[PDB]
Write an enzyme that holds these catalytic residues in place. Structure first.
Site: not given
Length: 430
Positions: A174, A324, A356
């Site tokens: 991330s 995502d 995600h």
């Protein structure tokens, strides 16, 4: 926590003689108690070291290092990058790592993070995790982040008297993957003496602009604002342009996101469905100078970049959820595509059925396995960028084989638990 808030700590300040220190030189150190350090019988320290900011000025930063009880030889440095995702100082990884439960960004250090750093320490790797956003907490500022990470690795080498050719590997997801890709991108020009043997990152934001337009107005619109905040903190010319155009709502909102204690959970909860353009008097903000030019610098996608983007040649593992909903897949796919065309070595793992937070777990065991392989010089030979969904027990050894029973059980208990983003983690395999 174990130490005072970073705002109340002179350790988180740049000294007046900062210009006398070389890049990655240690200014101060202190022993600190950390959850990961206690759990793995590894001594943890905080290093105040010299690094460089976006405006090319000498500044200080803080990194946390863990010294394994029984180190591997030759020395191996595992650089881990957390998804801090905030523009306030006390959201710093170093503060979150400390024993205690009151740190505003504590969540970034207690879920998959202890499993990853725990695993690395059990392998005998020296572990460094830098405060990659710096003292200004400039979220998503690529040059700021990459330089801080590379000097953080230099700091550990200097502190532990490790050989100049010590093997280095980098990992993150991330916001941590943005920091990781930028560190690998700047390595050739900024830190060429570092023996980087591998890198592994997933859910990677590769373009500041594309992540902004993806997130703006949606449930995670706080990160779009945090990105605007972080870039402005790193680019004074952007700060001035935006400040002049902020309305009353915009001025109080920008102060709020930069306020003490306003971290990842607060960013998530406070700004859902915020249109960042409602804070300024201009919808065409991104297309105008100097923002348009800055965004062409704040990307590793060559098609968007106003410069020649580096193509790291060492073995890399990159993973992403195709569906995502937080970090857009296609810019990351384009990056892989571009890099492979220019001669990169990328093991690419796009998951067709994931989100995600579930791809964060799907790619974890393969990520760590890949890093061990990079350290051992045994990474598999693959066609660059060819889609191979990475699955523990199928394409890599199982969670128990890679992590051990203890850490694999910790990973399994994350299934169905809330993450930093509010969304739950899933199983180890898709």
């Amino acid at each position: 926590a174990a130490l005072p808030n970073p705002y109340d700590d002179p350790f988180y300040t740049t000294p007046s003689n900062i210009g006398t220190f070389a890049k990655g030189q240690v200014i101060q150190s202190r022993k600190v108690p950390t959850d990961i350090g206690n759990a793995n019988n590894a001594a943890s320290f905080q290093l105040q070291y010299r690094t460089t900011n976006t405006q090319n000025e000498a500044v200080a930063d803080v990194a946390t290092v863990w010294i394994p009880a029984k180190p591997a030889s030759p020395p191996k440095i595992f650089s881990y990058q957390v998804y801090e995702d905030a523009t306030a100082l006390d959201c710093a990884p170093s503060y979150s790592y400390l024993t205690g439960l009151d740190q505003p960004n504590k969540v970034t250090a207690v879920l998959d993070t202890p499993i990853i750093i725990g695993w690395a320490l059990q392998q005998g790797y020296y572990v460094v995790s830098s405060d990659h956003e710096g003292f200004k907490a400039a979220f998503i500022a690529g040059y700021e982040e990459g330089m801080a990470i590379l000097d953080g690795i230099r700091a550990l080498k200097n502190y532990q008297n490790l050989p100049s050719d010590s093997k280095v590997a980098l990992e993150g997801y991330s916001g941590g993957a943005h920091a990781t890709v930028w560190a690998t991108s700047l390595a050739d020009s900024y830190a060429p003496e570092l023996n980087i043997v591998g890198a592994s990152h997933g859910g990677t934001p590769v373009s500041a602009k594309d992540t902004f337009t993806f997130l703006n107005g949606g449930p995670f619109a706080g990160f779009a604002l945090a990105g605007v905040s972080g870039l402005s903190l790193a680019h004074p010319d952007m700060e001035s342009f935006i400040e002049a155009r902020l309305n009353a709502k915009g001025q109080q909102t920008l102060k709020q996101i930069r306020g003490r204690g306003f971290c990842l959970p607060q960013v998530v909860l406070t700004y859902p469905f915020l249109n960042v353009f409602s804070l300024v008097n201009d919808t065409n903000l991104l297309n105008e100078a100097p923002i348009a030019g800055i965004l062409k610098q704040e990307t590793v996608v060559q098609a968007e970049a106003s410069y020649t983007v580096s193509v790291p040649k060492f073995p890399r593992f990159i993973w992403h959820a195709i569906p995502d909903e937080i970090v857009p897949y296609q810019p990351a796919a384009t990056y892989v595509k571009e890099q492979c065309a220019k001669g990169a070595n990328i093991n690419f793992s796009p998951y067709p059925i994931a989100e995600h937070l579930t791809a964060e777990i799907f790619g974890l065991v393969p990520s760590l396995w890949f890093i061990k392989q990079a350290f051992d010089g045994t990474t598999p030979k693959v066609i660059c960028g060819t889609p191979i969904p990475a699955i523990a027990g199928i394409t890599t050894p199982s969670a128990d084989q890679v992590l051990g029973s203890d850490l694999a059980n910790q990973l399994r208990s994350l299934n169905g638990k809330q993450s930093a983003f509010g969304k739950p983690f899933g199983p180890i395999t898709p």
